[PDB]
Design a binder for these strands. Structure first.
Ligand code: NA
Ligand code: NA
Length: 326
DNA sequence: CCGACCGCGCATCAGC
DNA sequence: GCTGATGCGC
DNA sequence: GTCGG
């Protein structure tokens, strides 16, 4: 909102480095810079001002100076005037098409969605799904739809086995008004980190979701992770809902509530909580919470039966998901 | 100055 | 056919 | 590209 001109620039630069330069760490630098400036409560007036922010160094400082004087960035103007870079960049918007595949397609003249449709033969299964749902995957999901989608997932999971537990996480669980996909964490009493005593725990749930025609396509599926496509049923009279990306992860039950914690976020809240654990003698990753020895050695994972248990261990007032922005 | 920069499940490829 | 590396999205 | 050891 407040510095959107700069942050659009920094994001554009980020996409370039990831997709064209294949410089993943520059991409994440530019993103880090863009997030920190999006959070800044004043109109940036100089590159020096921004440089005080963590993640803005000397090069982004001068790019801001240029952007403020001229309103554009010549480096970005050249990049956009270059047919190759813009086609590689554009093609990475197809899910399953990354910097490698996008580069290769462009090298042999496949540069547009239409070009991809002509050469569907040359796409893997994931890429074909990405092409089919190209528009729908770039749409947001309003929360009311999210709420409907959750009702379906939780009802259908329960139909396979009442002993399943399923949680939709992400920004949605924090009460976000819109989401980018649906992220479901699944667990069962028979699946602990010490033994698997059920063969097809995730399969049974994806299969039930398919048979009620909620899950429509599969991008990838194994014993513990499903990535696919779903759609809310259309109400006979009205327009169809866009197809939506959904992930479902089967997590061992002794690690489930640490998983919920980590995948609920936010990322800034995770890292402030991971930092406070350390100060009080514990380390938390996405799987466990462990005490630290006097010399920095992690002990065994502590029992966790709810989220608040993790809070109890590190002597933190419980934080409801809606209050975990920072 | 110099290396770290999230780590991992799955699909596919590369090399055998 | 096998095992390990790579691409990819998260 | 930025940071911190
Ligand atoms: Na800085
Ligand atoms: Na892509």
């Amino acid at each position: 909102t407040l510095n959107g001109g700069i942050t659009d620039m920094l994001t554009e630069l980020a996409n370039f480095e990831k997709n064209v330069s294949q410089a993943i760490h520059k991409y994440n630098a530019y993103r880090k810079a863009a997030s920190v400036i999006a959070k800044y409560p004043h109109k940036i007036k100089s590159g020096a001002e921004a440089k005080k922010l963590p993640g803005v160094g000397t090069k982004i400082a001068e790019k801001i100076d240029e952007f403020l004087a001229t309103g554009k960035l010549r480096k970005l103007e050249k990049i956009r005037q270059d047919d190759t870079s813009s086609s590689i960049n554009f093609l990475t918007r197809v899910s399953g098409i990354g910097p490698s595949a996008a580069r290769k397609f462009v090298d042999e003249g496949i540069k547009t969605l239409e070009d991809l449709r002509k050469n569907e033969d040359k796409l893997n299964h994931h890429q074909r799904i990405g092409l089919k749902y190209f528009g729908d995957f770039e749409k947001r999901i309003p929360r009311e739809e999210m709420l409907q989608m959750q009702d379906i997932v939780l009802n259908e999971v329960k139909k396979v086995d009442s002993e399943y537990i399923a949680t939709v996480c992400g920004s949605f669980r924090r009460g976000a008004e819109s989401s980018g996909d649906m992220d479901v964490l699944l667990t069962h009493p028979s699946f602990t980190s010490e033994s698997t005593k059920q063969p097809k725990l995730l399969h049974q749930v994806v299969e039930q979701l398919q048979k009620v025609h909620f899950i429509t396509d599969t991008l990838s599926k194994g014993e513990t992770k499903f990535m696919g496509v779903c759609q809310l049923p259309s109400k006979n009279d009205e327009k169809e809902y866009p197809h939506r990306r959904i992930d479902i992860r089967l997590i061992p039950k002794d690690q489930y509530y640490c998983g919920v914690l980590y995948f609920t976020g936010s990322d800034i809240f995770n890292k402030n909580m991971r930092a406070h654990a350390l100060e009080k003698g514990f380390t938390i990753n996405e799987y466990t919470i462990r005490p630290l020895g006097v010399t920095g050695v992690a002990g065994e994972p502590l029992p966790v039966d709810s989220e608040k248990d993790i809070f109890d261990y590190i002597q933190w007032k419980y934080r409801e998901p809606k209050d975990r922005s920072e």
